[PDB]
Amino acid sequence: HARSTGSYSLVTQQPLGGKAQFGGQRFGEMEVWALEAYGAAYTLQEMLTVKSDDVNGRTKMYKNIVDGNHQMEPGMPESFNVLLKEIRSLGINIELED
Amino acid sequence: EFDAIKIALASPDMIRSWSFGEVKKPETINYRTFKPERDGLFCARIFGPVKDYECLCGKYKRLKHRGVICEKCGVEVTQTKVRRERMGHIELASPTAHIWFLKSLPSRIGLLLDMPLRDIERVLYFESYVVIEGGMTNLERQQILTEEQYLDALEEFGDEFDAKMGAEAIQALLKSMDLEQECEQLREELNETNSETKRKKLTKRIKLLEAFVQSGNKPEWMILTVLPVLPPDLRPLVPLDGGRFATSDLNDLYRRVINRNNRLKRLLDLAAPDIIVRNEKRMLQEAVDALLDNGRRGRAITGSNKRPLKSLADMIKGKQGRFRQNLLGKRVDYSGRSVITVGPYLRLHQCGLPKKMALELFKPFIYGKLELRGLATTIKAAKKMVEREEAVVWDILDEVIREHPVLLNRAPTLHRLGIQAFEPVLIEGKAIQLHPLVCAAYNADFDGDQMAVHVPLTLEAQLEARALMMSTNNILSPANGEPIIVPSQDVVLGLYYMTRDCVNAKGEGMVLTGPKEAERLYRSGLASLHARVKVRITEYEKDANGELVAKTSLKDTTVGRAILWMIVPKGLPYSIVNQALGKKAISKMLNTCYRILGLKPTVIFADQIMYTGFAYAARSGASVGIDDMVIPEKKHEIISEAEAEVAEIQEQFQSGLVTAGERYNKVIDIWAAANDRVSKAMMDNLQTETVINRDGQEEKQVSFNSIYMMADSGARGSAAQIRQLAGMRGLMAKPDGSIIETPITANFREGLNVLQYFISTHGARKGLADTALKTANSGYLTRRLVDVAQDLVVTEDDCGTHEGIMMTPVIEGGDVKEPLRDRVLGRVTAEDVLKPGTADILVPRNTLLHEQWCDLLEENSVDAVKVRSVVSCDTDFGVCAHCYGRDLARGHIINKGEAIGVIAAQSIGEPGTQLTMRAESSIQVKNKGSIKLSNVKSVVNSSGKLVITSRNTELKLIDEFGRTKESYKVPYGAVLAKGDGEQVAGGETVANWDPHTMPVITEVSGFVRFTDMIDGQTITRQTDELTGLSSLVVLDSAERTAGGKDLRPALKIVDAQGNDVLIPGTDMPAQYFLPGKAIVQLEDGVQISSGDTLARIPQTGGLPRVADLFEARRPKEPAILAEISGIVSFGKETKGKRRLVITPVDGSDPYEEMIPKWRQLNVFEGERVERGDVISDGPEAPHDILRLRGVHAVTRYIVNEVQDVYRLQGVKINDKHIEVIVRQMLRKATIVNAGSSDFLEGEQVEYSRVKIANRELEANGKVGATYSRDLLGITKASLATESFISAASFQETTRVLTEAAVAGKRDELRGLKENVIVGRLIPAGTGYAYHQDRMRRR
Amino acid sequence: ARVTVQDAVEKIGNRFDLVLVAARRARQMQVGGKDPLVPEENDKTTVIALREIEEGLINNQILDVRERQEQQEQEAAELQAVT
DNA sequence: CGTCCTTCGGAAGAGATTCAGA
DNA sequence: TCTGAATCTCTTCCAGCACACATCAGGACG
RNA sequence: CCUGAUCAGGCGAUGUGUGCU
Ligand SMILES: [Mg+2]
Ligand SMILES: [Zn+2]
Ligand SMILES: [Zn+2]
């Protein structure tokens, strides 16, 4: 099984799971630890920021690859915004200070 | 863009500021046209337009109409992403308690109002009343009432009086409370009490109040009035294949809440009666408590079947929330997965990869190369070209491969060698080929393992994958300085076949001009592969200052050794291949190549080793056949003799001569002896089997048996497995843990009958169940360790301090288990090591101890180095460089920026898959040496030996050199045949004692008088049958009569003239106190001896042991210690438990401790103990070690015990990782004396914050503060962090977020998890350079 | 071909500054800043960057000096646009 | 149809329950 | 009369991936 | 983002079981 860029999920903008659904692999928590064990930082940043979420960042990434400029932009994961709306939907104010 | 996250409570003004519109109706959709309701849950006039820039009623479909709301239906024309952002509110008609602030345990309302949680449940759930502002009445402020109690209170108090029900009463209480008067009166009642539980309750309440007034919150914000709803794209309504819509549970939850709210609005509109609106408000309270956290109630509400609904807290918590599911581990594009296979022709910096996966992974790269060269005009043309597959795309794909690394991954990624980089090589097929030397590092065989591949898109990721993660850079493990490119099985069988020698083959003794015509001989066939021959070889010794000296000579070797010599590079000598070359020898061959020549010859030499190993293992043809396992012909006779001996033992037992256990142990001993005899017979029969002529007469040599070479080379198996294939297979176990007396006399070459196979099946299913549960315990332990670590990056260069631990080589009492060279390798000293001769600075105090300095210490025989451990480092928020040491995966010192908590916890928890899950007579010294006593107070007896009046005498064996090589522990009152520094002989008994009796030995002599001994109250005359005993017996503690209750015996030693002999040094006589179960041996009117017994006083390892160390459980029967020095005595007469009084010499004595009954004391009255002494026996507790001895003592205890576990199972772990996990364990501390500081007294704070608190006060002219360190478990020192995102991504999220909400706890960044969550750079090396730039920016 | 980067690690002795300096250099070469100072083997810009580091003529100070000398020329051609 | 009517686990943490000496 | 030390009661979590299959508010009044 | 012709349509959450590592 292999996935370049296919359909995305709906409640949190991530790739799907499986083969019959055209989905990608799961970069799990132990693999995040194994890249933190090296000093790899840009690899983990794009592995859970641009290749996986951050819809503006990944459209800019696809245009930059097909134009020939290997350059990413950080942005922010959309599922973290989902987490803010879920905690904020309780009686728990959460913000982002400046 | 932003620093620290803030969290607080939600004001009703804040919720109305968030919300855009009110939600009133429960209906969602219209189901004919699926446009939603007017307002409902899903909406248009509250949450946004459905599609991209289109109105609802069909008016505006263009950006030119952007911005204005509709005049018909009111739809602010904006992107549908806005329905992911806007929110709504529900105006409740009656206030409602918030369930996270009601049943969190501890209840925040329950210890703010100082009220029982049962009574607050009775107030909130509409069955009771409670007084609010009673006045000058017969009632209190916190009195709870019922219906008849309220009726009576009204009929006595029809005047001003108030008592209500529900959330209104709680909100009135929280509104009518002034926090200032509460803080003042609680400080008053702290100062005006002495009770400890009161001080605990009052300090929790005063911390809540003084952290609540510091925040800007209000206690009536804990009761909801305006409740928010979630945005509709986060609770979506999915179209199932059918008629209806499948929905999430939240739509049902909000629908029930809105229906109940509308019915309550109707009942308050139409002026309903009181019981009906009580039932209505109770149902609304239970609905909101079902929505915010379901399951904390009784029967949790269900949707359609036997499953509870999933609420908002369930969409955060657990294995499948948003922390452990969607934010730590994400699913990733540009990736793939398949099954692996071998392909040995690769070089170990590249891997195979299928053409189909390559073309599916590199679609945008192929697009960008096709519409750059001009072979396609646009993206549609490029997509049709790479779908039609013209011939040019394989050329373009071979151009985009060429230098682009990919990341291979295996699914259980334990340690950091599980993700590696490779250059791709294209394969027709569907299976990932994988180089064979890397599979031992993956711990992946080829019985169907699947691996995943990831692609680095950007340019920095390709450079990280080449510089850090490439397969030719990870050739040293970070757990220990050992190679990880160990040649595994076919290659070592091939090399062991290639370098051996038989005593005669083709081409014997002829002389050869070099290795080249040796290969030209063997390829033609004139000379056999292993036949000894004088050759001329030429070796390069690099003895000059980097310049290669060529020497050449004639060696006497085989042919296979010469053909192997055509591969070894220049620098290595020839004596490394003149041996037999098993597995150990080829591993140290690669190690010496890496030590001498560097990196590139070692990589290319590993590739040439694997190639020549596979080639000559193919040329050998080492098969295996049923005739290659030689059964001995002594096996039958040894079994017949063992059966004759068990028959003789059974004929002893069948007439009344021996017992059962005696026969059982006799049988198991003689079967173990017969087992070892059969094992030695078969091993001799294999190893000296082949006898062949050489010039006539026969000659023995080592054998060319197939299974013998496969066991001797070390490819597969050990001696025990070939023992089970040729000799008898021992004595198999049983589920009781016992061992069956009838062994398995057969072996696998012969048959087995039914019962022997069944007995084998017992142990087989035992081992399988052990591994199957061992995997889950290993994973959970690795998770807890890496989440208590990783706040910790090497972030300085030198602390510039002098503290540190004292390293010594370890001795248990057997042979020396780990010498000094493995422990004091690669770690910077603290003190400059004194030369033992005279006062020379042997090493300077800031030198990294590499192997040459370790050998110099081995020369000059130093036994203890004060080295700079991590646990005494003095770095704020991190660990400096010269307290950590060497990197162990590279050569140099640690770099400023490399994360060490993660590699530490991975190297500790990775061997957890290899850890199992389910006397006291004398001292027999081993070698000749010299005797050193340690902490003894002894006296010479009349017999000439030495007897011991101390309790912790250590007996160290000095050798002839000056070092200790054996050590033991002699208990109280033994016999020493030696003295201070006398000479021993090999095998001599030097110390001997009694396992049963605690001796009551003496120091002086003369007449003996009894005092306070009563035949009837204290002692009695116990006489055994036919005078088996005739002596006075002291009765025990509680069983004596109350008239003799307070009386205690004393045996007083007086002179020959009756006058009192005093203790030499004091003026108190030498009387001995008799405890319970004492038997008077030497009687009244007896001159006695020195060292004289006056009475007779008789009496789980594995992975849970590592868990119990790192969690710091106290054991189930702890060993008590003495918290303060001084003499020891007894008080209370054991009303359940017996008091113990300890009194110092020159200080105060406010100490007492009540020992259980039920714990035997290893202390008399006269043992004036020091703090750090045991009083009873048992396992020793880590909290006791920390609060009595010191931090260095507790870290030595933890490193020695967990190294005993991991070293008994045969695994090497360097001590840095265990010490840094200890540092993260003992981080928090408590305050004792505040002084001029800013902390309350009985308070807990982290050690770094209090350390830089009184570092500005100490350089100035004020007084500091005093800290007492406090050791926590790893699942407590992770839930107690200066951050809540770590403590919420760990275990339970509810109590962490409720404490953060009531405190207003502002979370700064700069951990590792707090940046992985928020999606920015880690402060490990690359991003650590970036964060240095950002910190000098601000 | 640059299977091992050990010479580059010797010439920038941190193992972590090498990635940043090589990334800055390869972003200069790909987007279109310069041409390489070593004759290529039809390789990629990553391998060319680490190859130049192994030659020993690029690190952070040389990159900053050459960027300042290129930035002064943009201000040395702007002075002619004023006159 | 339109609308609506409702019984098998190990331990730490925190809140009740005896207790004995004053 | 009253307070510390032992005793009784609610909470949770348990490795990592793949596949297949059933189920999604129904019943009845208007 | 994908699949078909300046356009049209696709996008789940639970359990339960099996099997690999
Ligand atoms: Mg396997
Ligand atoms: Zn309109
Ligand atoms: Zn330090």
Domain boundaries, chain C: 1-83
Q: Which of B1282, B1216, B459 is nearest to B876 (CA)?
A: B1282
Helix, strand, or coil (residue B426): strand
B183 carries a ligand binding annotation = no
The neighbour count for residue B1097, using CB atoms within 10 Å, is: 20
* Contact present, B249 and B226 (Cβ < 8 Å): no
**Structure tokens given for A48:** 């859970």
**Structure tokens given for B757:** 């196979």
- Residue whose entry in the numeric block shows the structure tokens 């049958």: B1025
CA B830 to ligand 3 centroid distance, Å:
10
Amino acid at B21: G
Output phi, psi for B929, to 5 deg: -160, -140
Instruction: Please list the alpha-helical segments (H only) found in B127-178.
Output: 147-156, 166-175
DSSP state of B750: S
Which stretch of DSSP H or E encloses residue B1268? strand B1267-1269
Paired strand residues for B511: B534
* Contact present, B746 and B752 (Cβ < 8 Å): yes
Query: By the CB < 8 Å criterion, does A47 face chain B?
Result: yes
Q: Which of B1160, B1167, B1158, B1157 is nearest to B1122 (CA)?
A: B1167
Amino acid at B1203: Q
- Quoted resolution (Å): 3.8
Distance of B1091 CA from F21 C1′ (whole Å)? 66
Interface test with C, best of A36, A43, A70, A71 (most C CBs within 10 A): A70
Write the residue in B349, B599, B1329 that is nearest to C16 by C-beta: B1329
Q: Taking CB atoms and an 8 Å cutoff, what residues of chain A touch B85?
A: 85
Pairwise CA distance, residues B361 & B333, whole Å: 9
DSSP state of B70: P
Q: Which of C54, C56, C59 is nearest to C6 (CA)?
A: C54
- B343-347: long-range pairs with CB below 8 Å, 24+: B343/B427, B343/B433, B343/B434, B343/B435, B344/B435, B344/B436, B344/B610, B344/B611, B344/B614, B346/B425, B346/B433, B346/B435, B347/B435, B347/B607, B347/C3
Residue contact A69–C31, C-beta within 8 A: yes
Pairwise CA distance, residues B1015 & B1018, whole Å: 6
DSSP state of B323: I
DSSP state of B695: S
Residue contact A39–C15, C-beta within 8 A: yes
Which stretch of DSSP H or E encloses residue B968? strand B964-970
Instruction: Return the residue of B nearest to A96 by Cα.
Output: B5
Structure-determination technique: cryo-EM
Angle at B149 between CA B143 and CA B153, to 5 degrees: 80
User: Residue B50 contacts by C-beta under 8 Å, 6 or more apart in sequence?
Assistant: B35, B36, B44, B56, B80, B83
Pairwise CA distance, residues B1130 & B1073, whole Å: 11
Query: By the CB < 8 Å criterion, does A68 face chain C?
Result: yes
DSSP state of B94: E
DSSP state of B1006: B
* Contact present, B1308 and B3 (Cβ < 8 Å): yes
Residue contact C49–B404, C-beta within 8 A: no
* Contact present, B1285 and A83 (Cβ < 8 Å): no
**Structure tokens given for B384:** 């049709």
Task: Show the beta-strand stretches assigned E in B205-250.
Answer: 223-229, 238-239, 245-246
Torsion of CA C48, C50, C56, C57, to 10 degrees: 50
User: Residue B926 contacts by C-beta under 8 Å, 6 or more apart in sequence?
Assistant: B815, B966, B986, B987
The tally of CA atoms less than 13 A away on the side-chain side of residue B207 is 15
Instruction: Please say whether the dihedral angle defined by the alpha carbons of residues B461, A59, B410 and B489, taken in this order, is positive or negative.
Output: negative
Q: Which of B152, B165, B206 is nearest to B182 (CA)?
A: B206
Pairwise CA distance, residues B28 & B1018, whole Å: 88
The residue length of chain C stands at 83
Q: What is the second-level CATH architecture of the domain C1-83?
A: Alpha-Beta Complex (3.90)
Helix, strand, or coil (residue B490): helix
DSSP state of B427: E
User: In chain D, which nucleotides are within 7 Å of a protein Cβ?
Assistant: 2, 4, 6, 11-16, 20-21
Q: Taking CB atoms and an 8 Å cutoff, what residues of chain A touch C31?
A: 69
Pairwise CA distance, residues B183 & B1240, whole Å: 13
Q: Which of B1323, B1227, B1209, B1328 is nearest to B1274 (CA)?
A: B1227
Residue contact C6–B463, C-beta within 8 A: no
The residue length of chain B stands at 1338
Helix axes B660-687, B635-653, angle to 10 degrees: 170
Output phi, psi for B460, to 5 deg: -65, -30
| Amino acid whose CA is nearest the C1' of F1 | A7
Pairwise CA distance, residues B680 & B982, whole Å: 42
Pairwise CA distance, residues B574 & B818, whole Å: 32
Q: Taking CB atoms and an 8 Å cutoff, what residues of chain C touch A69?
A: 30-31
Query: By the CB < 8 Å criterion, does C16 face chain B?
Result: yes
Pairwise CA distance, residues B1298 & B804, whole Å: 40
- B25-33: long-range pairs with CB below 8 Å, 24+: B25/B258, B25/B262, B26/B255, B26/B258, B26/B259, B26/B262, B28/B237, B28/B251, B28/B255, B29/B237, B29/B245
Which stretch of DSSP H or E encloses residue B1193? helix B1191-1208
Q: Taking CB atoms and an 8 Å cutoff, what residues of chain B touch A39?
A: 464, 468, 897-899, 1324-1326, 1328
Interface test with A, best of B41, B326, B906 (most A CBs within 10 A): B326
Residues 317-336 of B with CB under 7 A from strand F: 320
Question: Nearest nucleotide, C1' to the C-alpha of B303?
Answer: E25
Cα distances from B55 to residues B20, B50, B67, B74, B786, in angstroms, run 18, 8, 11, 9, 51
Pairwise CA distance, residues B4 & A97, whole Å: 6
The neighbour count for residue B134, using CB atoms within 10 Å, is: 18
**Structure tokens given for B170:** 């709680």
User: Residue B18 contacts by C-beta under 8 Å, 6 or more apart in sequence?
Assistant: A88, B87, B89, B228
* Contact present, B450 and B338 (Cβ < 8 Å): yes
**Structure tokens given for C58:** 């690029």
B854 carries a ligand binding annotation = no
Instruction: Give residues 401 to 420 of B whose Cβ lies within 8 Å of A.
Output: 407, 409, 412-416, 418-419
The residue length of chain A stands at 98
**Structure tokens given for B743:** 């062994």
Q: Which ligand sits closest to the CA of B61?
A: 2
* Contact present, B865 and B833 (Cβ < 8 Å): yes
Pairwise CA distance, residues B999 & B1091, whole Å: 9
Paired strand residues for B540: B550
Amino acid at B762: H
Q: Which of B1082, B1021, B1078, B1014 is nearest to B1053 (CA)?
A: B1082
DSSP state of C4: -
Q: A touches which chains (3+ CB pairs under 8 A)?
A: B, C
Cα distances from A80 to residues B415, B787, B1215, in angstroms, run 28, 20, 38
Task: Show the beta-strand stretches assigned E in B450-591.
Answer: 450-454, 511-512, 533-541, 549-557
Output phi, psi for B1164, to 5 deg: -90, -165
Q: How far A43 CA lies from chain C's nearest CA (Å)?
A: 12
Query: What is the CA B379 to chain-centroid distance, rounded?
Result: 52
Residue contact C20–B459, C-beta within 8 A: no
Helix, strand, or coil (residue B940): strand
Query: What is the CA B169 to chain-centroid distance, rounded?
Result: 49
- Residue whose entry in the numeric block shows the structure tokens 């009490």: B193
DSSP state of B74: -
Write the residue in B315, B334, B903 that is nearest to A37 by C-beta: B903
Helix axes B179-191, B196-212, angle to 10 degrees: 150
Helix, strand, or coil (residue C50): helix
Instruction: Give residues 21 to 40 of A whose Cβ lies within 8 Å of B.
Output: 23-40
Angle at B827 between CA B821 and CA B831, to 5 degrees: 100
**Structure tokens given for A86:** 């879920």
* Contact present, B842 and B836 (Cβ < 8 Å): no
* Contact present, B432 and B352 (Cβ < 8 Å): yes
Q: Taking CB atoms and an 8 Å cutoff, what residues of chain C touch B456?
A: none
Pairwise CA distance, residues B1038 & B310, whole Å: 60
User: Residue B406 contacts by C-beta under 8 Å, 6 or more apart in sequence?
Assistant: B351, B353, B361, B421, B422, B423, B424, B453, B454, B455, B456
| Amino acid whose CA is nearest the C1' of E10 | B105
Strand B816-818 and strand B810-811: the pairing is: antiparallel
Write the residue in B85, B357, B1330 that is nearest to A2 by C-beta: B357
B447 carries a ligand binding annotation = yes
Contact, B248 CB vs strand F, < 7 Å = yes
B799 carries a ligand binding annotation = yes
Write the residue in B328, B416, B459 that is nearest to A29 by C-beta: B328
Q: Taking CB atoms and an 8 Å cutoff, what residues of chain C touch B468?
A: 15, 19
Q: Which of B1224, B304, B258, B331 is nearest to A77 (CA)?
A: B331
Cα distances from C42 to residues B365, B456, B608, C39, in angstroms, run 17, 21, 28, 9
Paired strand residues for B1126: B1169
CA B1324 to ligand 3 centroid distance, Å:
19
Q: Taking CB atoms and an 8 Å cutoff, what residues of chain C touch B598?
A: 6
**Structure tokens given for B1313:** 């998890």
Query: What is the CA B829 to chain-centroid distance, rounded?
Result: 28
Residue contact A77–B362, C-beta within 8 A: no
**Structure tokens given for B1171:** 């703090």
Helix, strand, or coil (residue B533): strand
Q: How far B595 CA lies from chain C's nearest CA (Å)?
A: 15
The tally of CA atoms less than 13 A away on the side-chain side of residue B684 is 10
* Contact present, B293 and B100 (Cβ < 8 Å): yes
* Contact present, B787 and B1290 (Cβ < 8 Å): yes
Q: How far C55 CA lies from chain B's nearest CA (Å)?
A: 16
Q: Which of B1315, B1314, B1313 is nearest to B1327 (CA)?
A: B1315
Helix, strand, or coil (residue A34): helix
Question: Nearest nucleotide, C1' to the C-alpha of B319?
Answer: E13
**Structure tokens given for A43:** 């690899």
- B1201-1209: long-range pairs with CB below 8 Å, 24+: B1201/B1105, B1201/B1109, B1202/B1106, B1202/B1109, B1202/B1110, B1203/B818, B1205/B915, B1205/B1101, B1205/B1102, B1205/B1105, B1205/B1106, B1206/B911, B1206/B915, B1206/B1106, B1207/B817, B1207/B818, B1208/B1101, B1209/B911, B1209/B914, B1209/B915, B1209/B916
**Helices vs strands, H then E, count in chain C:** 4, 0
| Amino acid whose CA is nearest the C1' of F15 | B307
Q: Which of B377, B421, B423, B369 is nearest to B394 (CA)?
A: B369
Output phi, psi for C77, to 5 deg: -95, -20
Paired strand residues for B834: B841
Pairwise CA distance, residues B773 & B777, whole Å: 7
* Contact present, B887 and B391 (Cβ < 8 Å): no
Residue contact B1326–C26, C-beta within 8 A: no
Output phi, psi for B429, to 5 deg: 155, -165
**Helices vs strands, H then E, count in chain B:** 38, 45
By the 10 Å C-beta count (0-12 exposed, 13-18 middle, 19+ buried), B1020 is classed as: middle
- Residue whose entry in the numeric block shows the structure tokens 């294999």: B686
Starting at the earlier edge strand, list the strands of the sheet with B1072-1073.
B1007-1011, B1050-1054, B1072-1073
Distance of A14 CA from E20 C1′ (whole Å)? 24
User: Residue A80 contacts by C-beta under 8 Å, 6 or more apart in sequence?
Assistant: B327, B1317, B1318, B1319
Q: How far C76 CA lies from chain B's nearest CA (Å)?
A: 30
The neighbour count for residue B186, using CB atoms within 10 Å, is: 18
Pairwise CA distance, residues B809 & B827, whole Å: 15
* Contact present, B829 and B847 (Cβ < 8 Å): yes
By the 10 Å C-beta count (0-12 exposed, 13-18 middle, 19+ buried), B238 is classed as: exposed
Residue contact C20–B1329, C-beta within 8 A: yes
Paired strand residues for B1090: none
Helix, strand, or coil (residue B524): helix
Contact, B240 CB vs strand F, < 7 Å = yes
Angle at B1086 between CA B1081 and CA B1091, to 5 degrees: 65
By the 10 Å C-beta count (0-12 exposed, 13-18 middle, 19+ buried), B1066 is classed as: exposed
**Structure tokens given for B568:** 């070894």
Pairwise CA distance, residues C9 & C53, whole Å: 9
- Residue whose entry in the numeric block shows the structure tokens 């943009």: C74
The neighbour count for residue C48, using CB atoms within 10 Å, is: 24
Residues 260-289 of B with CB under 7 A from strand D: none
Pairwise CA distance, residues B318 & B310, whole Å: 12
User: Residue B869 contacts by C-beta under 8 Å, 6 or more apart in sequence?
Assistant: B804, B805, B827, B883, B1195, B1219
Q: Taking CB atoms and an 8 Å cutoff, what residues of chain C touch B459?
A: 23, 26-27, 30, 45-46
Q: What is the largest CA-CA distance in chain A?
A: 48
The tally of CA atoms less than 13 A away on the side-chain side of residue B492 is 24
Instruction: Give residues 11 to 40 of A whose Cβ lies within 8 Å of C.
Output: 39
